[PDB]
Amino acid sequence: MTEKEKMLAEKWYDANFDQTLINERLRAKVICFALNHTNPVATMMRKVLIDALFQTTTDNVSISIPFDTDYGWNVKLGKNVYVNTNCYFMDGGQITIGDNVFIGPNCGFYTATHPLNFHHRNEGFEKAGPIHIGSNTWFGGHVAVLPGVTIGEGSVIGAGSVVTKDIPPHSLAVGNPCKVVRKIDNDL
Amino acid sequence: MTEKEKMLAEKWYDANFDQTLINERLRAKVICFALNHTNPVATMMRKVLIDALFQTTTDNVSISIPFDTDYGWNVKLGKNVYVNTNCYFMDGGQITIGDNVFIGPNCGFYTATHPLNFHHRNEGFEKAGPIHIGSNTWFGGHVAVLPGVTIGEGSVIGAGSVVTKDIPPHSLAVGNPCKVVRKIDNDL
Amino acid sequence: MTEKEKMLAEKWYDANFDQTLINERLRAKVICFALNHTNPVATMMRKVLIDALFQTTTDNVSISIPFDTDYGWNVKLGKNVYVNTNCYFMDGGQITIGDNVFIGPNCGFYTATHPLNFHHRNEGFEKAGPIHIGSNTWFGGHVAVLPGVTIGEGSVIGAGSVVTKDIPPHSLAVGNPCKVVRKIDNDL
Amino acid sequence: MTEKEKMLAEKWYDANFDQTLINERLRAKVICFALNHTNPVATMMRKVLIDALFQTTTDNVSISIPFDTDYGWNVKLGKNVYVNTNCYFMDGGQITIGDNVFIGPNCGFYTATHPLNFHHRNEGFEKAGPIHIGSNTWFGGHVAVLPGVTIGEGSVIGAGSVVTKDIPPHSLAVGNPCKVVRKIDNDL
Amino acid sequence: MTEKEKMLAEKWYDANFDQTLINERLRAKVICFALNHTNPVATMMRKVLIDALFQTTTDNVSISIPFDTDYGWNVKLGKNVYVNTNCYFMDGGQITIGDNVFIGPNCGFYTATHPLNFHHRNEGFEKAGPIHIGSNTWFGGHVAVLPGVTIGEGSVIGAGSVVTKDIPPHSLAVGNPCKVVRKIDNDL
Amino acid sequence: MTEKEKMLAEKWYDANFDQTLINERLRAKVICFALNHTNPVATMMRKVLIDALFQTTTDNVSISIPFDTDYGWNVKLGKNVYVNTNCYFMDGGQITIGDNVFIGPNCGFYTATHPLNFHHRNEGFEKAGPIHIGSNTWFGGHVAVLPGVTIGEGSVIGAGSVVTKDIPPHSLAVGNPCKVVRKIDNDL
Amino acid sequence: MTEKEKMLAEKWYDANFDQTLINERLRAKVICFALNHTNPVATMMRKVLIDALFQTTTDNVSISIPFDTDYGWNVKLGKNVYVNTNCYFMDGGQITIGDNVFIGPNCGFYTATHPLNFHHRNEGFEKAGPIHIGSNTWFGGHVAVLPGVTIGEGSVIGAGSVVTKDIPPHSLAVGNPCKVVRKIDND
Amino acid sequence: MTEKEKMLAEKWYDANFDQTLINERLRAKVICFALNHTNPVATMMRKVLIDALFQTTTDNVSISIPFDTDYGWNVKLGKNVYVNTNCYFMDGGQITIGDNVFIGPNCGFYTATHPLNFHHRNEGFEKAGPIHIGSNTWFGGHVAVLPGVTIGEGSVIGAGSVVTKDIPPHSLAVGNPCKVVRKIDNDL
Amino acid sequence: MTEKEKMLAEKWYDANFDQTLINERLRAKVICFALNHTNPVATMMRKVLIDALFQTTTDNVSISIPFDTDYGWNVKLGKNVYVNTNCYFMDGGQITIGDNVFIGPNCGFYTATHPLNFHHRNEGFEKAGPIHIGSNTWFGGHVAVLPGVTIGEGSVIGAGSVVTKDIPPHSLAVGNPCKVVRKIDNDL
Amino acid sequence: MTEKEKMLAEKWYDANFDQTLINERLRAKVICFALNHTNPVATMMRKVLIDALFQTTTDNVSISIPFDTDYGWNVKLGKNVYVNTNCYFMDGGQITIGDNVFIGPNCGFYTATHPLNFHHRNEGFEKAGPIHIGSNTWFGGHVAVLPGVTIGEGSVIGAGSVVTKDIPPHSLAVGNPCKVVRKIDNDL
């Protein structure tokens, strides 16, 4: 297995020093740089860039600049995804986002886990923990989502939350660590 | 009432899909883009842009780039306002800032509330909650101020605070959620 | 003593209005602007800018753009320092970073303390509190490190932490405020 | 009263040497420069600039470049205003323009009066004379409108006219000085 | 008949709102923009632009920038035409210029007539009145030539004239309105 | 005598076809182009350009862009000269401007006379008529000053005037042709 | 007669050394250069350039860059003309294109004939042979159409064809030289 | 089925007028434009663009500019593919290229078939015919490969060939139409 | 012998992998890139670039952009060489062009031979076959000339020809493969 | 007397700290910067810049870039002056150059004398010593001409000479200090 194959298989891999991964990250950084330096008025150019970044034809995916991503192609998007200013989709582990998702400003979706032992960490080792963002969700600003976390559909994450553990569907959750406050009435 | 008139009247309105509001936000983003790509050395140009953004002649309002705002004209500023790097004044609801205000880096002043029910939220509805920042205040870095909040004059907000509720005047407040620690002696 | 000499001596000084300090901060902002607008593909140019900023020849110091610093020359770096997107080293007070340090995205290392009394604060006064980051450490994203804090070698800071007080060596610490959870086994 | 307050109150004021007024004029010139150097093809950008200039969301206000204005914010516009090439709205005194107004090329709307005595004039003094342009009007090319003048609704100003005095509604006026020729039948 | 066909046939047509005409005017404004932003040193480039604008190979047609025209292709030129700074050939109605013509600065040749009744004018209606400029003529600066006017060959128009009616050949004409002063001796 | 020497001696000369004169005009057109494309914020650069254009160190000579001149070096300026938008100093004949002169927008100072006979005019012949603008004068916008004219010190020229003949000192003059209305009281 | 007048009258003319013709070709090269260096995203700018090039308001004429033409004003276009990458309309002789025409990539429509004798050719002489492209036609990629050739309406030209002679209407033609294979039923 | 789904399933589809397909072609055209305007010296940037175009990390795929492709993601490449100047991979139908392939200049790989009947063709209909290029092949310059064609591994295609039908493995084939001349000895 | 010496001696050489040859090809691609991005109006710059490419002072060598060559210095030219759009001189093997040569658009002069056996070809090996283009020749558009071919002086090559074998002097030759049609009367 | 008037009168003056002189030097530095950054191909632009610098229409004055001068207007030139690379005409004191003068590369013509006493020198004082270069002279490369020096007509200055004293006409002079070797026979 290559280091990219280990990353995708959710095994420990050399994220920091593998040339292939460093080069795939470069491609995403180059496209993000072009996007981040495109005037907000250049609508068609932004659409072309976001599509080249995610390697898909997006359906109403709005991104407020700046935007950051590690690979781009490891972000799976639904239709109607609203991403405010300064978001980072650290996608070594697949980041799945449903339909009708509101992501506030300064939010980070982190899939990278480093070893706690400095000997293994200094070697460049990481384990990718995929993130699942359900459809019909709302994230306040200044939210950090940690590796392996699943946010159930219809859920609301309060501003400043650090989502360390899975949040069930149709729930209002807030805090550092993020804890469920109450259920949400999502009936028609 | 237009959707802009409803926004200003603190009623539910279509923020995401009203053409007038999308276009007024475009103007603020275009000015913010010009500001964010102006060399720090270009003092006169930065002043011109800051003044075009807020639609006012500022009196010692220092903004460290990048800066973000939704409308610009809905940010009411006093004299001597020091804004560090990466701040966002989400101003659908008026953001009133007094005189002599120190705003640390990575701070967000959020006035947008979305419905908890995904059916109403997916339709683009929002309610604007104005923020009142008193004169003679200090905000640490990484602070998020939530809709409808009032921070009394002479108050100090600790770094990493999530201001969910009103802070009284001459108070030291810290945490997520932000709670008053003690009063401040603000005598000459 | 000049205001720069008082800053370095850890005495109260006019940070905001001293021309020399305003001008030394301008130099760092001009270099940061050049770096932040350099395509990720321009490897040699990025190395030259990073080195001009810190006034030293760096040994494997990776910086993901954007990056911010106040002086640049008051950041003392070890070898193998990995800095993710949107970090700010507010270095009025010296920021000492050891070898093999992983700094996540959206981290702020703040050394500036303003007076609590608005009369002294409005005059532009500040006191610089140096930060010591030990070797072999790991910082999650969205971390804020406060003035005067020391993070012991071999320590791990969880994502979203607000480091208000010193963290001992070989410790796992998380939260707002940042508290030690358990010790780390850092043996070979 | 500041010199800006005197200008707006229709009192004598230092237009030429007051720093605030020189700086507010700079902002309008900077926006006019950006507009005048924007390709005619850049429709969205021209709209953004026109809106930043007048500090309002215009409704079908077409401006053929070059355009000049002193303040921009002192030009009050109606919907459907068609401004041909090389027009100047010298707006120290408010310039009110109604709905459905056709302004030919090389037209000047001048609100500045200087003293006749050179001693007072050389000191920089001016008096602002607001201009009222009624709705449903038509201006030929090469027209100059002088301070304090009112052009009644439904009126037509012939090419090369120098409008020194008020023109009544529904009238055809031509010449240097501009004199009424006959009334206009403005029935459906 | 299309609105372009009505314009050319000297019938009332929608000049302001017909897409074809708006688009043909855009082409002329794009070429004029390129010409107006071409350094005077770039002789060959200026020649190419002038020729692309008029859709003809010009024979000693000198144009001092800025220059404006509505269509460009509706300006019929002779050889040796000297056009000074800031001229506008509003050519909805054909503008025929003979050989050896001296056009001073700030001259406007206007072929557009709007209805006097605001109801018809607000609908975008216009009637094109062709202008005939005879060979061997001289125009002073600040001259406005009105729709349907013919200036006979060998004639001289004084500076600041508003040419409302036809001028006979070999005549000296001045004023607002433009009136013949005396005949000119144009013998060898 | 060269054609430049004849121009300066107020004799008939080939203005249009002499290579030396065509080339001296090019230099002025190149400097005016640079000035006309300099952002209003670039104060020192504008000052350098105006100084290079007039071949002198100006003392408070304000020029609002665009500005046009034929030679530049044939414009003799006093201190405190305020030139509004779109002025043209056609300086084949020396244009002498005193101290404390207010020149409104769209003003033309024309020193070129062409022969009335088309045979001599088509050959490129011209006679330069110097213009003398007295100190302490005020020009309204849309004014044209004809060759050989002298405007006495302390005089005021109304907007839209065509100055065909000399105007005595301390006089208010208006119209096409420009005629004295009354004397001005210019006492302290 | 000027050299431009001789060119248009289908007479021998100095194409290579006449200043007027060299200058009219420069105008087309300058507009083509602007078009070839315009980002595909800049839709309105591309439309303005194509219209300035052909000296007409085009009706759904799509051009994939790069594009080349000698004069541009001697290309007469119909509505719905789809021109793929790297096409050259060498238009000294008028190039008439009908409505609904699909032109594949790397196609050349050449109207210039040089003399066979090198003495006359070295002097710069040429004769323009107009090309008529009928409405409702399809050209494969890598096709060269030679001077004086008429391609009848409803016809299909196979990829790699060298069209030396007239192709009748509603015909499928392929090869070097281009020969009719069969008729097309377009009813 | 969408028009993209029909294209991929090898069914008749609207290639010319489907918005999704027009937009996916735009993305490839934008990346090709960036590649075609990148200096040959910019090796890393060219590699990033080629990888963004094909949506894969290429292994020694050399491309000489200009290069054209319709989708980019429908070109499946092996390692060591050498593409000379002016090649076009019209990839509506998948273009599969093996390892060690030499493609000469001015080659076209066309997968688009239009209907012979003009009624269906004018409607925008097309059928995608995938092309299979075997490993270890060599294409001379000026080669056109037609829809549905398979070129067997170890084969050589002569310059100027029009490949209308399948070519067997280890064969030398030349002409318009392309016909096998002789077999190739491809032993070690 | 080096690989360059082997190339010039008409021996098998590592064309694709020799560092020196790769670097000399880079020089030719950099000059071709600069020339292909030079506006047609820039006559002297084009001349300088053409002369730098061929390493010679050309005498009436007109090249229509785009142009391509491998080395440039291996193309020997005569006087009066007219090269139309999109021509490629692949000159690892010397290309000799006499005087008075007309080369139509989309012509390729190919001197590269690859081995037929894929084992040797995959190793990067090539053999250069010089091409000799006699004086007084004419090439139609879409012509490919193959390695080692001589086209006799006074010859005419029909459009679309694939020149596989030598063409005698004073001959009309057309087709794929190119064959002589008749001799040419080349008398005065 | 102003400091510029003292400079021109050959009296001691504040060269380093007088604002007028610092600003007149800026104008020359700006024109030299534009000249030094103009491509050698831009012949007409170089001629315009050289003429703007010297404030005269030059007659065959060739200048190889870079070129430096302090004022430009204090360099009096004859016809046919050939200036090689890296020359500096330090012209506080008038530099008079005759006709037919060959100036080698890296030559300095210095007219500035500073006081020997550091007290007066540190105050910014200088005395301008004009340089007279006779017609028909030749300067080798690396020559320095000192203040007040006169080089007689027909003279030759050897490479590396430091001209401290006057050189008589028709003489060959070499060395540091420059001494006459022999007279030159300058007869027809």
PDB file of N, CA, C and O in Angstrom, chain B residues 53-89:
ATOM      1  N   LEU B  53     -16.349  51.827   2.672  1.00  0.00           N
ATOM      2  CA  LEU B  53     -16.971  50.652   3.262  1.00  0.00           C
ATOM      3  C   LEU B  53     -18.050  51.002   4.307  1.00  0.00           C
ATOM      4  O   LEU B  53     -19.211  50.565   4.195  1.00  0.00           O
ATOM      5  N   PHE B  54     -17.661  51.818   5.308  1.00  0.00           N
ATOM      6  CA  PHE B  54     -18.547  52.231   6.384  1.00  0.00           C
ATOM      7  C   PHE B  54     -19.455  53.391   6.018  1.00  0.00           C
ATOM      8  O   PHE B  54     -20.392  53.684   6.765  1.00  0.00           O
ATOM      9  N   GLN B  55     -19.221  54.006   4.830  1.00  0.00           N
ATOM     10  CA  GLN B  55     -19.958  55.170   4.306  1.00  0.00           C
ATOM     11  C   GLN B  55     -19.907  56.309   5.327  1.00  0.00           C
ATOM     12  O   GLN B  55     -20.932  56.886   5.655  1.00  0.00           O
ATOM     13  N   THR B  56     -18.699  56.605   5.849  1.00  0.00           N
ATOM     14  CA  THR B  56     -18.477  57.648   6.868  1.00  0.00           C
ATOM     15  C   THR B  56     -17.007  58.014   6.870  1.00  0.00           C
ATOM     16  O   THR B  56     -16.181  57.210   6.437  1.00  0.00           O
ATOM     17  N   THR B  57     -16.664  59.188   7.381  1.00  0.00           N
ATOM     18  CA  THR B  57     -15.270  59.602   7.545  1.00  0.00           C
ATOM     19  C   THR B  57     -14.875  59.101   8.926  1.00  0.00           C
ATOM     20  O   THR B  57     -15.359  59.633   9.919  1.00  0.00           O
ATOM     21  N   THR B  58     -14.055  58.047   8.987  1.00  0.00           N
ATOM     22  CA  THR B  58     -13.607  57.476  10.257  1.00  0.00           C
ATOM     23  C   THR B  58     -12.603  58.393  10.961  1.00  0.00           C
ATOM     24  O   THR B  58     -11.892  59.163  10.315  1.00  0.00           O
ATOM     25  N   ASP B  59     -12.576  58.318  12.299  1.00  0.00           N
ATOM     26  CA  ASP B  59     -11.668  59.090  13.154  1.00  0.00           C
ATOM     27  C   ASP B  59     -10.846  58.077  13.945  1.00  0.00           C
ATOM     28  O   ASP B  59     -11.319  57.548  14.957  1.00  0.00           O
ATOM     29  N   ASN B  60      -9.636  57.777  13.440  1.00  0.00           N
ATOM     30  CA  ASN B  60      -8.680  56.843  14.021  1.00  0.00           C
ATOM     31  C   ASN B  60      -9.266  55.423  14.211  1.00  0.00           C
ATOM     32  O   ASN B  60      -9.232  54.851  15.301  1.00  0.00           O
ATOM     33  N   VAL B  61      -9.831  54.860  13.124  1.00  0.00           N
ATOM     34  CA  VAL B  61     -10.347  53.495  13.115  1.00  0.00           C
ATOM     35  C   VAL B  61      -9.254  52.679  12.383  1.00  0.00           C
ATOM     36  O   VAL B  61      -9.061  52.856  11.177  1.00  0.00           O
ATOM     37  N   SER B  62      -8.460  51.896  13.141  1.00  0.00           N
ATOM     38  CA  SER B  62      -7.382  51.090  12.560  1.00  0.00           C
ATOM     39  C   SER B  62      -7.897  49.679  12.338  1.00  0.00           C
ATOM     40  O   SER B  62      -8.420  49.048  13.269  1.00  0.00           O
ATOM     41  N   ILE B  63      -7.766  49.189  11.100  1.00  0.00           N
ATOM     42  CA  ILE B  63      -8.167  47.850  10.744  1.00  0.00           C
ATOM     43  C   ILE B  63      -6.970  47.109  10.151  1.00  0.00           C
ATOM     44  O   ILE B  63      -6.418  47.548   9.151  1.00  0.00           O
ATOM     45  N   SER B  64      -6.558  46.010  10.812  1.00  0.00           N
ATOM     46  CA  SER B  64      -5.504  45.098  10.378  1.00  0.00           C
ATOM     47  C   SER B  64      -6.169  44.084   9.431  1.00  0.00           C
ATOM     48  O   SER B  64      -7.173  43.484   9.784  1.00  0.00           O
ATOM     49  N   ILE B  65      -5.652  43.949   8.219  1.00  0.00           N
ATOM     50  CA  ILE B  65      -6.188  43.031   7.218  1.00  0.00           C
ATOM     51  C   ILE B  65      -5.914  41.525   7.538  1.00  0.00           C
ATOM     52  O   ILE B  65      -4.900  41.225   8.148  1.00  0.00           O
ATOM     53  N   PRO B  66      -6.787  40.563   7.135  1.00  0.00           N
ATOM     54  CA  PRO B  66      -8.061  40.749   6.427  1.00  0.00           C
ATOM     55  C   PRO B  66      -9.178  41.209   7.329  1.00  0.00           C
ATOM     56  O   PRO B  66      -9.161  40.953   8.535  1.00  0.00           O
ATOM     57  N   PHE B  67     -10.126  41.932   6.734  1.00  0.00           N
ATOM     58  CA  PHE B  67     -11.337  42.380   7.415  1.00  0.00           C
ATOM     59  C   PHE B  67     -12.549  41.929   6.609  1.00  0.00           C
ATOM     60  O   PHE B  67     -12.497  41.906   5.380  1.00  0.00           O
ATOM     61  N   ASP B  68     -13.630  41.583   7.281  1.00  0.00           N
ATOM     62  CA  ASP B  68     -14.855  41.205   6.609  1.00  0.00           C
ATOM     63  C   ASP B  68     -16.065  41.871   7.263  1.00  0.00           C
ATOM     64  O   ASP B  68     -16.103  42.113   8.485  1.00  0.00           O
ATOM     65  N   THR B  69     -17.047  42.179   6.412  1.00  0.00           N
ATOM     66  CA  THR B  69     -18.321  42.772   6.781  1.00  0.00           C
ATOM     67  C   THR B  69     -19.342  42.400   5.731  1.00  0.00           C
ATOM     68  O   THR B  69     -18.977  42.126   4.590  1.00  0.00           O
ATOM     69  N   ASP B  70     -20.610  42.337   6.128  1.00  0.00           N
ATOM     70  CA  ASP B  70     -21.685  42.018   5.216  1.00  0.00           C
ATOM     71  C   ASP B  70     -22.191  43.217   4.426  1.00  0.00           C
ATOM     72  O   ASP B  70     -22.403  43.066   3.226  1.00  0.00           O
ATOM     73  N   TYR B  71     -22.442  44.370   5.088  1.00  0.00           N
ATOM     74  CA  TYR B  71     -22.988  45.577   4.449  1.00  0.00           C
ATOM     75  C   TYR B  71     -22.056  46.789   4.560  1.00  0.00           C
ATOM     76  O   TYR B  71     -22.023  47.610   3.643  1.00  0.00           O
ATOM     77  N   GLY B  72     -21.307  46.877   5.657  1.00  0.00           N
ATOM     78  CA  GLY B  72     -20.428  47.998   5.981  1.00  0.00           C
ATOM     79  C   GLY B  72     -21.175  49.193   6.558  1.00  0.00           C
ATOM     80  O   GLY B  72     -20.830  49.697   7.636  1.00  0.00           O
ATOM     81  N   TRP B  73     -22.220  49.668   5.840  1.00  0.00           N
ATOM     82  CA  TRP B  73     -23.025  50.832   6.221  1.00  0.00           C
ATOM     83  C   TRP B  73     -23.869  50.599   7.508  1.00  0.00           C
ATOM     84  O   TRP B  73     -24.388  51.554   8.101  1.00  0.00           O
ATOM     85  N   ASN B  74     -23.982  49.336   7.942  1.00  0.00           N
ATOM     86  CA  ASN B  74     -24.704  48.988   9.160  1.00  0.00           C
ATOM     87  C   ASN B  74     -23.775  48.779  10.354  1.00  0.00           C
ATOM     88  O   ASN B  74     -24.183  48.224  11.366  1.00  0.00           O
ATOM     89  N   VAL B  75     -22.524  49.242  10.229  1.00  0.00           N
ATOM     90  CA  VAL B  75     -21.541  49.264  11.313  1.00  0.00           C
ATOM     91  C   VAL B  75     -21.413  50.757  11.688  1.00  0.00           C
ATOM     92  O   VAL B  75     -20.993  51.563  10.859  1.00  0.00           O
ATOM     93  N   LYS B  76     -21.858  51.120  12.896  1.00  0.00           N
ATOM     94  CA  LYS B  76     -21.775  52.485  13.383  1.00  0.00           C
ATOM     95  C   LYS B  76     -20.572  52.555  14.313  1.00  0.00           C
ATOM     96  O   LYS B  76     -20.510  51.833  15.304  1.00  0.00           O
ATOM     97  N   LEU B  77     -19.576  53.374  13.940  1.00  0.00           N
ATOM     98  CA  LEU B  77     -18.316  53.481  14.671  1.00  0.00           C
ATOM     99  C   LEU B  77     -18.112  54.788  15.414  1.00  0.00           C
ATOM    100  O   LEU B  77     -18.506  55.859  14.937  1.00  0.00           O
ATOM    101  N   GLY B  78     -17.415  54.687  16.541  1.00  0.00           N
ATOM    102  CA  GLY B  78     -16.976  55.842  17.313  1.00  0.00           C
ATOM    103  C   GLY B  78     -15.557  56.159  16.894  1.00  0.00           C
ATOM    104  O   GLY B  78     -15.053  55.572  15.926  1.00  0.00           O
ATOM    105  N   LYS B  79     -14.888  57.066  17.601  1.00  0.00           N
ATOM    106  CA  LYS B  79     -13.493  57.378  17.281  1.00  0.00           C
ATOM    107  C   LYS B  79     -12.591  56.392  18.037  1.00  0.00           C
ATOM    108  O   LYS B  79     -13.028  55.840  19.053  1.00  0.00           O
ATOM    109  N   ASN B  80     -11.340  56.190  17.560  1.00  0.00           N
ATOM    110  CA  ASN B  80     -10.338  55.324  18.204  1.00  0.00           C
ATOM    111  C   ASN B  80     -10.795  53.874  18.371  1.00  0.00           C
ATOM    112  O   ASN B  80     -10.944  53.402  19.497  1.00  0.00           O
ATOM    113  N   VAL B  81     -11.024  53.162  17.245  1.00  0.00           N
ATOM    114  CA  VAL B  81     -11.440  51.757  17.245  1.00  0.00           C
ATOM    115  C   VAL B  81     -10.291  50.953  16.612  1.00  0.00           C
ATOM    116  O   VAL B  81      -9.906  51.188  15.457  1.00  0.00           O
ATOM    117  N   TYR B  82      -9.707  50.056  17.398  1.00  0.00           N
ATOM    118  CA  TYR B  82      -8.545  49.277  16.998  1.00  0.00           C
ATOM    119  C   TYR B  82      -8.943  47.842  16.762  1.00  0.00           C
ATOM    120  O   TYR B  82      -9.267  47.120  17.707  1.00  0.00           O
ATOM    121  N   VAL B  83      -8.974  47.450  15.476  1.00  0.00           N
ATOM    122  CA  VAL B  83      -9.405  46.142  15.025  1.00  0.00           C
ATOM    123  C   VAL B  83      -8.221  45.330  14.526  1.00  0.00           C
ATOM    124  O   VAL B  83      -7.647  45.663  13.498  1.00  0.00           O
ATOM    125  N   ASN B  84      -7.866  44.256  15.241  1.00  0.00           N
ATOM    126  CA  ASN B  84      -6.777  43.397  14.812  1.00  0.00           C
ATOM    127  C   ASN B  84      -7.169  42.459  13.655  1.00  0.00           C
ATOM    128  O   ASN B  84      -8.275  42.539  13.137  1.00  0.00           O
ATOM    129  N   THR B  85      -6.223  41.638  13.204  1.00  0.00           N
ATOM    130  CA  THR B  85      -6.339  40.729  12.057  1.00  0.00           C
ATOM    131  C   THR B  85      -7.491  39.753  12.097  1.00  0.00           C
ATOM    132  O   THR B  85      -7.794  39.196  13.135  1.00  0.00           O
ATOM    133  N   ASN B  86      -8.085  39.504  10.941  1.00  0.00           N
ATOM    134  CA  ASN B  86      -9.159  38.552  10.765  1.00  0.00           C
ATOM    135  C   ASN B  86     -10.434  38.782  11.613  1.00  0.00           C
ATOM    136  O   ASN B  86     -10.894  37.864  12.281  1.00  0.00           O
ATOM    137  N   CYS B  87     -11.024  39.997  11.537  1.00  0.00           N
ATOM    138  CA  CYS B  87     -12.294  40.254  12.206  1.00  0.00           C
ATOM    139  C   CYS B  87     -13.437  40.335  11.211  1.00  0.00           C
ATOM    140  O   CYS B  87     -13.234  40.662  10.035  1.00  0.00           O
ATOM    141  N   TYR B  88     -14.628  39.972  11.674  1.00  0.00           N
ATOM    142  CA  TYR B  88     -15.828  39.917  10.851  1.00  0.00           C
ATOM    143  C   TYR B  88     -16.986  40.553  11.603  1.00  0.00           C
ATOM    144  O   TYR B  88     -17.386  40.071  12.660  1.00  0.00           O
ATOM    145  N   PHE B  89     -17.503  41.651  11.042  1.00  0.00           N
ATOM    146  CA  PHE B  89     -18.665  42.357  11.545  1.00  0.00           C
ATOM    147  C   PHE B  89     -19.858  41.960  10.650  1.00  0.00           C
ATOM    148  O   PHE B  89     -20.098  42.588   9.619  1.00  0.00           O
TER     149      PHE B  89
END
